[PDB]
Amino acid sequence: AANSKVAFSAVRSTNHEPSEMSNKTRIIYFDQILVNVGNFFTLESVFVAPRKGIYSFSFHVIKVYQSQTIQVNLMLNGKPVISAFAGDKDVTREAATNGVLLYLDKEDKVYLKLEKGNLLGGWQYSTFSGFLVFPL
Amino acid sequence: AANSKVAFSAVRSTNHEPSEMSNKTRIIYFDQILVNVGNFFTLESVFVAPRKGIYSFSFHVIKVYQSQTIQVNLMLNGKPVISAFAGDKDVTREAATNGVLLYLDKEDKVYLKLEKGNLLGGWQYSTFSGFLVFPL
Amino acid sequence: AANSKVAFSAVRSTNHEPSEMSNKTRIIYFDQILVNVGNFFTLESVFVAPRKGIYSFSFHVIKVYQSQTIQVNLMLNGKPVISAFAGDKDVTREAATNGVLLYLDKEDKVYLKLEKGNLLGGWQYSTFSGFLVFPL
Numbered sequence A, B, C: 001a002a003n004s005k006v007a008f009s010a011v012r013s014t015n016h017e018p019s020e021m022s023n024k025t026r027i028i029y030f031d032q033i034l035v036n037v038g039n040f041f042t043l044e045s046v047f048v049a050p051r052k053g054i055y056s057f058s059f060h061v062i063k064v065y066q067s068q069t070i071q072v073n074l075m076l077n078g079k080p081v082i083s084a085f086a087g088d089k090d091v092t093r094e095a096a097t098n099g100v101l102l103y104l105d106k107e108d109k110v111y112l113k114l115e116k117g118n119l120l121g122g123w124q125y126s127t128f129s130g131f132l133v134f135p136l
């Protein structure tokens, strides 16, 4: 727990339907916390950068069945930064997955929003993780 | 080769059918070692954590043709931790890919098991990699 | 900007057709630079290792529509090291994604080449990122 050590990792462990709040914010959440060094990943959904630096993020959102399609956005402070897609009607399961490095200021917020579609059948096995590569 | 420096990366370089041992253990292996700092990735398949800390892992298992479906599990000490899927009959090639951070104790073992399906046509171009993000 | 701190991340921000030069080299490029600490990622396409060490790389190339198929190769000094595929005619959007750790000498060049297919409809939302895990 030095301040150079910041990481989190989370999974959706069940096929439960989305909560009301997730339903309105459209923000995807992950209930099983595998890693949360620094406790800067809060509300099962959003990471708050503790300091200025480069941060790695990666996500893998699985649609149990066709949705029809979903578009997942990686959000930084209310603006979409990266996008991923899961599309075909016949194909299940399909995953909207992507990853990236980001320059973050202290208090910056990174999280996943669902732009299109919904996680109706649950999004079990979906993953969200990130860490501080180095401070700046 | 300081003890803070631990990483491995591996690929399946051919389309050869699985070995007998892999056939019985159902544990996926990777013959071409790109990186293995610390030599803690052994038997082409399993990583043994040298010390307590946070470790990144990612995998990308490719089914050459429909299997029909495969489910790949990321294993920690005999228990499944993360899962990925490659499904459709018509779609080739499809990949079961996922990744995660894990809190590991010294001597913890992380590896890939094939829960469903088999790698009959070979799993060429498949990748397995991981590293120590920081010690704890 | 210490010499242990090396990272880059890039996105294709539009659906514009490939440039003439990209057309001839078959080398994929990314116009929106999210991160480029050390400025060792140049020409929107190729990373030049500043020092000996282990480097993480990951890519996610999206074909807007069927191509028919694309094969993307991760190149190190003119030789393919890792491969990824996006295949089916009916499926859009599909992604050729993969990642890996590599042992790199100073001046080594890592970049993405398009072995099969073409990025005709654009490759918007595609990502290419990498960083120095540790020096050796």
Ligand SMILES: *[C@@H]1O[C@H](CO)[C@@H](O)[C@H](O)[C@H]1NC(C)=O
Pocket (backbone or CB within 6 Å): A017, A018, A019, A020, A023, A117, A118
């Ligand atoms: C949430 O919004 C969806 C549309 O995405 C709607 O169909 C559903 O009924 C709403 N409520 C809940 C609890 O899911």
Ligand SMILES: *[C@@H]1O[C@H](CO)[C@@H](O)[C@H](O)[C@H]1NC(C)=O
Pocket (backbone or CB within 6 Å): B017, B018, B019, B020, B023, B117, B118
């Ligand atoms: C291994 O097990 C599979 C079932 O997954 C079986 O069909 C095959 O014949 C077995 N032996 C070998 C060498 O693959």
Ligand SMILES: *[C@@H]1O[C@H](CO)[C@@H](O)[C@H](O)[C@H]1NC(C)=O
Pocket (backbone or CB within 6 Å): C017, C018, C019, C020, C023, C117, C118
């Ligand atoms: C580039 O090469 C492709 C084949 O991949 C060709 O069809 C196209 O006309 C060429 N020129 C441009 C500007 O894309």
